[PDB]
Symmetry: none
Subunit: 75 residues, 4 copies
């Protein structure tokens, strides 16, 4: 496991992975999901890793399709 | 024997499984994902399983939260 | 005079209308949004209009694009 | 004085404005929609305003709710 660019933890994340349909944390490196799980993912973080405490909130992947642009920056 | 209620196949489906971030088919049994993969999932289907040929459309989970209402039926 | 088929009210709705970026109600007629605003929309209803209380939920148009299939079975 | 921070144009943009349900461009100023319309919106841009050609893509507002975190960066 490489040092991830970002780790979101302490949340509710649906994965669409029959093995573990729901996790509380996910690690992202170069735009790719490198790990999913719980607080233990934090063991991979260094000073360069950005961390987001989801504060028990649900988290879902941003709409990502080649035919639609998701307008960001509103409110 | 485990039989899914619905099987969406021949599409593009993003998952948060690091080992399989993109599949073309997903199986659903009473509201939960039972399996993901390719058209081999259709071998698990039976007369009762609803099957949807995504015709290469991207499949995304609909907004599913008690605080959100998805407005249906707009043309 | 137009009477909407449906009115979704008491919600939180973004419009992309600079005049009123957020409203609490929307009126639907033959699949089209024919009005946006607040509770005053309910004055346009008749017994045939279906009124739905959004219960303060944030209401978002369903994603409808020919290239996307929104899974509703979950 | 007050200039747009971003301008998306040449796309397909649905608005909940009954009088103008569909536009191809929108102007965003400090998180707020300032204007909607066509290519003419580019005339309101300075050099600091970020501009994006949607290349005919459909543009949809991002999910913005305090109960949900939209994972960015893929």
């Amino acid at each position: 496991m490489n040092v991830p660019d970002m780790i979101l933890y302490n949340g509710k994340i649906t994965t669409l992975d029959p093995s573990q349909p729901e996790v509380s944390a996910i690690a992202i490196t170069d735009g790719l999901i490198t790990a999913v799980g719980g607080d233990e993912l934090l063991n991979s973080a260094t000073e360069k890793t950005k961390k987001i405490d989801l504060k028990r909130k649900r988290a879902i992947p941003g709409l990502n399709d080649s035919h639609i642009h998701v307008i960001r920056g509103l409110e």
